[PDB]
Amino acid sequence: TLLTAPDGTRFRDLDGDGVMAPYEDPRLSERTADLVGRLSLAEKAGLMFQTVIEVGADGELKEEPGAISKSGTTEVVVGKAMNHFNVHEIRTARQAARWSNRLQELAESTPHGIPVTVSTDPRHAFVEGPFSQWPEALGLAALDDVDAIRAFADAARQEYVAVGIRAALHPQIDLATEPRWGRQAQTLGHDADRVAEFTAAYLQGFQGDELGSASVACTTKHFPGGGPQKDGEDAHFPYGREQVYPGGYHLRPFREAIERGTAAMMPYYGMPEGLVRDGEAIEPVGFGFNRQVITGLLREELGYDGVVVTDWELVNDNHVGDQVLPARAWGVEELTPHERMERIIEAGCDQFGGEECVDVLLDLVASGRVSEARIDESVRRLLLVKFRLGLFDDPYVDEDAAERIVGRADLRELGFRAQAASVTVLENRERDGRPTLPLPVDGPRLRVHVEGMRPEALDGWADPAAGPDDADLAIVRLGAPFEPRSDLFLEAWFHQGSLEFPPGLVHRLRRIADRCPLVVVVNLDRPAIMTPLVPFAAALAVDYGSSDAAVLAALTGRIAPEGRLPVEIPRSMDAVRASRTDVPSDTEDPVYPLHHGLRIR
Numbered sequence: 001t002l003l004t005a006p007d008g009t010r011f012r013d014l015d016g017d018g019v020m021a022p023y024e025d026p027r028l029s030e031r032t033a034d035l036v037g038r039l040s041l042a043e044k045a046g047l048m049f050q051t052v053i054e055v056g057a058d059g060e061l062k063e064e065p066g067a068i069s070k071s072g073t074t075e076v077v078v079g080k081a082m083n084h085f086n087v088h089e090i091r092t093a094r095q096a097a098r099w100s101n102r103l104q105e106l107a108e109s110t111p112h113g114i115p116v117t118v119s120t121d122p123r124h125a126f127v128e129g130p131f132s133q134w135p136e137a138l139g140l141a142a143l144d145d146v147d148a149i150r151a152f153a154d155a156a157r158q159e160y161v162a163v164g165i166r167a168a169l170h171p172q173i174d175l176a177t178e179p180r181w182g183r184q185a186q187t188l189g190h191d192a193d194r195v196a197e198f199t200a201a202y203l204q205g206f207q208g209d210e211l212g213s214a215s216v217a218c219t220t221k222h223f224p225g226g227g228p229q230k231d232g233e234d235a236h237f238p239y240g241r242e243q244v245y246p247g248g249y250h251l252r253p254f255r256e257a258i259e260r261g262t263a264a265m266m267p268y269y270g271m272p273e274g275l276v277r278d279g280e281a282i283e284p285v286g287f288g289f290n291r292q293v294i295t296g297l298l299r300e301e302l303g304y305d306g307v308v309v310t311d312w313e314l315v316n317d318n319h320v321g322d323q324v325l326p327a328r329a330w331g332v333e334e335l336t337p338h339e340r341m342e343r344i345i346e347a348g349c350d351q352f353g354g355e356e357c358v359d360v361l362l363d364l365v366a367s368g369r370v371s372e373a374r375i376d377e378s379v380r381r382l383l384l385v386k387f388r389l390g391l392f393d394d395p396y397v398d399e400d401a402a403e404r405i406v407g408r409a410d411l412r413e414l415g416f417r418a419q420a421a422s423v424t425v426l427e428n429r430e431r432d433g434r435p436t437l438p439l440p441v442d443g444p445r446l447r448v449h450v451e452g453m454r455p456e457a458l459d460g461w462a463d464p465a466a467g468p469d470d471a472d473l474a475i476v477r478l479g480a481p482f483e484p485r486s487d488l489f490l491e492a493w494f495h496q497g498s499l500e501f502p503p504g505l506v507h508r509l510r511r512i513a514d515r516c517p518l519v520v521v522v523n524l525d526r527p528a529i530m531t532p533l534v535p536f537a538a539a540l541a542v543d544y545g546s547s548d549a550a551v552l553a554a555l556t557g558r559i560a561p562e563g564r565l566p567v568e569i570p571r572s573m574d575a576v577r578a579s580r581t582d583v584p585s586d587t588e589d590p591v592y593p594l595h596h597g598l599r600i601r
Contacts, residue, residue, distance in 0.1 A: 001108060012393060014113035023112075026393050032383040036376055039112060044372070044379045045361045046081025047114070048351050050309055053085035059098035061106060068320075071356060077106050080358045083116045084309075084351065084382070086169060090123075093130045093163055093406035097399045100164030104395040114383075115391035119167030119219065122186060124156055126419060127523065127545035131159050132411035137172065138524070139422035139544030141189035141198075141566035142597075148418060149188075149198045153205025155411045157216050162405035164397045166389050167217045169266065171202040173253035174225055176567050178581035180232020182482070182495045185525040185544060189566030190227065190584035192249045196256040203260040211263060213390035219309060220257040222268030224293060225250025228582035233496060235269035237488060240496075241286070241330035243270040247583035255302065263385050264307035266353070267294060269314075271330040285331035288314050288344055295348035307381045312354030315340045325489050342369050350378035417559055419543070419550035423521075424563030425598040426530065427540035436517060436539035437600040438557030439473070449516065452477030457548035461556075468515040473538070476509060477521045477551065480528035499529045500573050506532045513537065521551055527569045531591045557600055564597035 001013045003020070009027065011020040015038070022028055023035035036044075053073065054066040061073040068088055076082045090096045100118060107116045126133040132155055134140075140149055160168070174183070175190040188195050199220070206216040226235070226243070227250060233240030257265070267287035275282040280292075287293050288310040298304045311328065315337050318325035326333075329340050341360055344352065352361075364370040386392060428435045440446065446462045449471035455464040465471035483497030512518050517538035522528050524542040533540060541561065543551055554561040568585035569592040570576045579587040585594045 001113075012113075014108065014392070015111060023392070031387055031392070032380055035112065035383060036379055039379070041362060041365060041372060041375075042358070043081045043111060043114070044375050045358045045365075047083065047379050047382045048361060048375070049080070049082050049356050049358055050084035050086060050119070050351055050353050051076070051082070051356045052088055052354070053103075053118075054088050055090055055096060055099045057091070059095045059102070061099065061102050073103065074106065076356055077103070077116070078109055080356055081110060081114075082356060082358065083107055083110075083114050084119070084167075085116065086119045086121065087165065090129050090131075090163070093402040094399050096163035096165075096406075097397045097402035101396050101399070104164070107395075115386055115395040117167050117217070117386060117389070117391065118165050119169050120160065120165050121169045122172070124152070124415065125185075125545050126547050126550075127185075127525075130407045131156075132407055132415040133419070133547065134415040135419050135422045135543070136185040136525070136545040137188050138176070138185050138566060139418060139546070139563070141187070141194075142422045142424050142544060142563035143418070144194070144564060144566065146197060146201050149201045150205045151414055152418070153202050155414055157206045157214070159406045159411065160216050161214055162397065162402040164395070165216070166391065167219060167264070168206055169219050170221065171199055171218060171257075172221050173199050173257065174222055174227040174268075175250050175253070175584060177227050177250075177584045177586075178229050178232050179499060179527045179567065179570055179576055179587070180497065181227060181229050182232075182234055182526060183226070184527075184567065187227065191566075192252040196253045199253045199256045200260050203257060203262055207261070207263065211385070211388040213394065215389055217263035217385050217389055219264035219266050219307075220254065220262040221266035222270070222311065223254050223265050223287065223298065224267070225254065226268040226270055229270070230273065230581060232581065234494060235271065235286075235328070235330060236490060236494065238326055238330075241269070241271045242273040243268075244273050245275050245582045247580040247586070249584075250582065258302050258304050262306060263388075264309055265298065265304065266309055266311055267349070269311050269328045269330055283331075286314065286328065288349060289329075289332050289340070289347050291347040293347075299348050305381065307351060307378075307385060308349040309351035310344060310349055310353045314344060315352055315355045315360070316357060321489065323489065338363060338369075345370055345374065350381050416547075416550055416553075419546040420553040420559035421561065422563045423541055423543050423546060423551060423554035423561035424524075424565055424596075425539070425541045425561050425600055426569075426592050426596065427534060427537060428598050428600060429538050431517065431538065435600065436519060437541070437555055439519070439555050441556045441558065444472070446472045448472065449474040449512070450476075453548045453551070457552060461552070468512045471516045473517040473519060474512050475519045475521070475555070476512070477523065477548070478505075478528075479523045480526045482526065495525055498573055499526060499570070499576065501529065501532060503532075509533065510536050519555065521555070527567055529572060529591070530569050531571055534591065561600060562597070564595045565592055566594075568592065568594040
């Protein structure tokens, strides 16, 4: 629909007039102002919803309910005037870019062809496609290198933009002050100052200093800080709704994100319990419904005028599977969807995440509950980002370029080096004068008993042992322990509760160590109580979501492990329960303190 105007301009014709209205004019900055004037009420409402969308298996628009999404794409894009979606499973780069182009063409069919903003959750961590593979964010914190964060952000920005992903549901700049929290791995530790520095590098790396045609707009989360979860239980669950502040910091990275112009901001599900800020009691309700936090603090006190999108599904219950996913309507559970949605608008948010109930919003306007003037305030913010990203002018991508950019060998090597070098060594006992690590790359052909790691990963370097008895050493990878739960939906997908290893698992490792030197590598999605392992492991290390090969690269010193603990490892669960969930690494006598890491040679 690229046309040549009577005055000479080349412009995208989005309403089809054959003429170039101002909002369709690329010369202009003010084209939001012009487009707000032309949009129907249903178009304004469509803008204030963002939900999951699925890529068709062969690059086609999914027109049927999927694993997660429930409406057809034409339904949401055309029938509901929606144009913000969080994309899920991507198989190939070509697939994603072709589907993106198809999606953007469909979006032209709307009365004013508002382009689609496709966002995504973090999708580069090896422990969860075609993207470069990295450790989890906590691994970058273990490297404690501002340049590695610049490098990640630019790498991921190149890969996102190649397939038409122009929004990030991140950085996640919550602080991991509560060790039982099952979302620590996606943080950058708990040092508010350090995290704030990473935040500037992250937003600059993804957004630039000004949003443009190669930018990714960031949705910084989870405002005002999701880390201090009461008893470590997470606000995804109706038993984990509360955040508590017994130590009276978490806001500080978000002030940086505001100073840096993060294009959007996501309040957490969390409900603050017993919080007083400057002598003023804070309403005990989910931050998305909390006018004090969104309007008083974020809008007025901090001066933030970017987009505010709720966390996912605050308004309606669901029924995926055959039991009930509850709306995360924490502290307002007794409100109906209409009343929830109204309360979110009143709190000062602009967009409902994980919802597509545009008719509910049109209801409120027709009921007189919400003014079109109020809607215009949010429509203005949402439209701005689309215009500043360049999406009104060129939302299309190159399929062939996409196949070459995404997972490019140099980005894969960056990410693989991050995986290996973020490995953090905790104990490294000395065999006969030689430390256990690095393991011999030369030396003898070793027989290695492996558990938790693929034996195929030894290929070329060592022979798999049938067991500890015929092994020169054992390499055991373990996840951090947790309380296995499955009473509610998603519980099986979270790692919550106690950080202690089962005693029979500890004994089995001890039986291994009685026969051969034992190297334990723990995937530190949470700070496992390492203490019972310390008396018999020949070496103790942690990774933050590293492949078997990257772990082996670190353990042999091929890529030296440079990680230092970005959170402490508590000595016992007793020490955890005695600590304050909002205070960083404040357990007493941690078995490995904050910043601990050993160099190997």
